[PDB]
Assembly symmetry: C5
Homo-oligomer: 243 residues x 5
């Protein structure tokens, strides 16, 4: 018939200690391209989960409702953030952000692209193998499945528009020092996942795949150090049985 699955997917911003869940390690700056060795806890990664479905005929994903969870937490301007001026409140989270989700019946297919092909990525990350200068533009060698939570750095990977026949994905990147976060919540908004032929993602092995990245911006500490802040994403997916 029809079934609904829901999930809250936690962000994977780096979590530099047991208290700073949802933040990255402070950002380094001005590393030469030839000596760029980022620490694991400084690198936000894609979130993903496989949701098992009742077995029989295949589950077909028809609609998704999704939103970013805890957007009002950024109205805490009393904790940790640099004052905007003498006697002023804390600096809001602002700057470069990326909001991305995907729903599919297979893992999200990703293409690798690097700012700096010579970056030395740390143990525990999965990044483009044997990168060249061409890895800074399009290098068709860099193909991956988003098949591990907290492993694929957001800065290394994008959804692959040449694949993903069985996934729908949506993402917006906004770059800049002072970019304001703009986030909407409503339980009245639905994305239809049906393609031009009226067919949604088909859950291959009774598995539904949800993927996210919600880098909200940079938190500026009193010291001037900066950390990424991320938030969880909710998914509610309606499925129907197809032959």
């Amino acid at each position: 018939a029809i079934t609904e699955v829901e999930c809250f997917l936690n962000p994977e911003m780096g979590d530099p200690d047991e208290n700073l869940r949802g933040f990255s390690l402070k950002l380094s700056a001005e590393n030469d391209f030839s000596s760029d060795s980022p620490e694991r806890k400084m690198l936000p990664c894609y979130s993903t989960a496989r949701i098992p479905l009742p077995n029989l005929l295949m589950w077909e994903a028809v609609t998704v409702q999704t939103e970013v969870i805890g957007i009002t937490s950024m109205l805490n301007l009393h904790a940790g953030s640099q004052k905007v001026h003498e006697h002023g409140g804390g600096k809001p989270i602002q700057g470069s952000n990326f909001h991305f989700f995907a729903v599919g019946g297979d893992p999200l297919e990703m293409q690798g692209v690097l700012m700096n092909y010579r970056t030395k990525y740390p143990d525990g990350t999965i990044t483009p193998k044997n990168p060249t200068a061409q890895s800074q533009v399009m290098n068709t060698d860099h193909k991956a499945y988003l098949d591990k939570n907290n492993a694929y750095p957001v800065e290394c990977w994008v959804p692959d528009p040449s694949r993903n026949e069985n996934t729908r994905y949506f993402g917006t990147f906004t770059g800049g020092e002072n970019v304001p976060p703009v986030l909407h919540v409503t339980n009245t908004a639905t994305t239809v996942l049906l393609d031009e032929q009226g067919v949604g993602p088909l859950c291959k092995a009774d598995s539904l795949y949800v993927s996210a990245a919600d880098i909200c911006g940079l938190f500026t500490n009193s010291s001037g150090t900066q950390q990424w802040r991320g938030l969880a994403r909710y998914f509610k997916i309606r499925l129907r049985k197809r032959s």
Copy 2:
């Protein structure tokens, strides 16, 4: 609050109007609509915000006329919310640049209200259901607030323990709580957060705009126990005092909700 019978009968329409005041903190009797001045740079390990500094969600339960003559029959009637017209009241008050605000430069006018803002409303037949999320799980929240109980590091992302009903006016801090998209089957909610030091407030008014509250099946919120719930948060931005201190500024929200009678089984 005005509950008006626009039409009687089977095709009965009722319109409920109300002005929900903001709950920005009100640090003294003269600064209604404003918070206490903001502190800054508290370590996560010693973050003890004062009550009057924390904007809270506004909410009211509006009782409706009882529809069920005899409680012992196959079909009962319930009020169904079909549309809402809503706007923020007093947006032009921010054109007062002569009172209290820091000059933008030598010989200049006062600094406009600007910076992080949040505009939110909900209409439902049950209390708004909220999920807790914290900037800093170690924040020590003051007496008179209701905040996530026994928070952990997971409370900075998603901790499913932090479930609450917006069941008290001027108590749930906006920074601790969001509407819960996993619940609220019987509420419609809408909110926009815009963060940043210099974000301009952008506010529209018109008596020509209506939000339809009907779901995919053409059913609006159904008023359980003859109760309509309105909720709001309208943090317009930060007011900068001549000293350089900053206070949140909030404004009241108007609601006009059109309801009709729906028959349901017992």
Copy 3:
């Protein structure tokens, strides 16, 4: 009144409504007095010429009757735009240079663009930044304000019944009234907000409600109201003045039958 059918077998009225920014001298029409800053809430006594006010005009219409069914003028559509937006491309006159050897500073900052069309004067609700503000002679402002006047105080009800008298900072259109008026406004606040203004003669606003009924000129009068604060002009001295522009209205009306 009970509304019947549209009479078949249309007229258009137009008006240019001047802004009321304060007009501090005979040469500065369209500007306010220089803005004061940092007045304590307890001693805030703004000068009349510093306070932009709502603009309004009544357009008289011919009565349609002689004697069960009467005729009334019904407003169906309005075309409206702000007049003189290109005047802000004058960066040579009076404005502070943006830097050494540069052109003048554009008008920018907080702006408010508002219009209403109705068959009754616009109904307004009072809200104050500072309830203790002492408003000057010649203004009409909320009577006996309290701290609650900084949020919603239902005592503060007015008719926009005088041109150049109701300060924009004290009054908003009242969404709890205005049964017989349509209003539209946008406030954009901030030091450096860029003005964004569109002109086109191809845009029409429909004034018909859900039942297909426009404002009814019950007393053979049509009411137009405006506020168009474009932003702040920064003088070479560093002083700032509000700048306002006129608004054009073209309203299409038809005859509507109503029950006596």
Copy 4:
């Protein structure tokens, strides 16, 4: 004046194309498409802008295939875009470095993008920042302006009947006239406003009014008007000049029967 049916058949449809060059002031033989460097901080009582500092409206009359005297050419659609937007990616020539060792400063700041298509010259209304501005020989500006010229003065009516003569800062399209023209403009003011310009050959603006009637070409003439001030160019010295670009028009016309 009375509009009847669209006439079809062979040669009942025509398309005209044209490029309108911008008229930014052209301060010397090499600086076509730029203004003279901007002055700043002139007192309102002593504001004497040089001709070459004042961008003006562009306009042209396009003759159409002669029809006799009744059929008229009716403008149905226009495709239009600004030409040469990528020229602003030259940050090596003339522009002030953004900081030590940086590239040149992009063109940015106040901009105005405007076009009109009609069967009569564009009708304009005059509005001035400063009524006391002394406009130079070779410009056509509001005649005998008063303080009221800073808001709405109904005396200031003109036809856009001369290319490179009507300063953009003095004139706007008149919404009270232009029955037989369709115009569209956006003003964006501010020091740091980014230019945002779109190109595509797939986008069409429909010129038909509510009754399905386009501009009707009196005397087999089509009128195109433009102003495309893209922003300010900042020289290494800090001096600023307006930069303008040409506008392309492709207009589709059909034959319409009317009566006299």
Copy 5:
């Protein structure tokens, strides 16, 4: 003379950006920008000038003739998340802060047609002396700073036509569809969307797509994302590759 639709093929392509590539390690970047060259002595180096990207995709030789007709395109910019690397090379925003994001003037442009993209030349400075290896407006005058109808070119060579010299020509391109947005300014934030759910229809008002004249499909792009600011304060253009997926069908025509 276009007759009935007669079946379907799909071509896909990744078009690399041509930002200047100042050395073998800085593929996708330009040479550092010069500033404040007088209009009378403006001699930009080749590797400082982003150029239009283009490729001709040969299609099966179908020959009343049949021609391949382009019906839809799906396109997006590839690698937008690479700009979240604020640890490599970029100037700190302040003491102890992270690197400065890529920002400033950007241009995002694509075209699909059955002929080479037709371009019109327009120059900031007609006196610019363009370097060997570029194709720029021939015999420019002051009118070349506004509209000079002499400056007509085909985008017929990859990495040769500087973006700053050329725009798509709206007076031609009968057999091409093009789309571009320019956003100018020092601190403009890049805003880029990805989704595999967006399709652009290439059919004109008569329901006819670009017709592949000599069994050739033409894709063109420019995706200048903004300026990268080095620790030193020097700036370089950053560009990204563009993906195309084009659906074609067979169309009967007279001849």
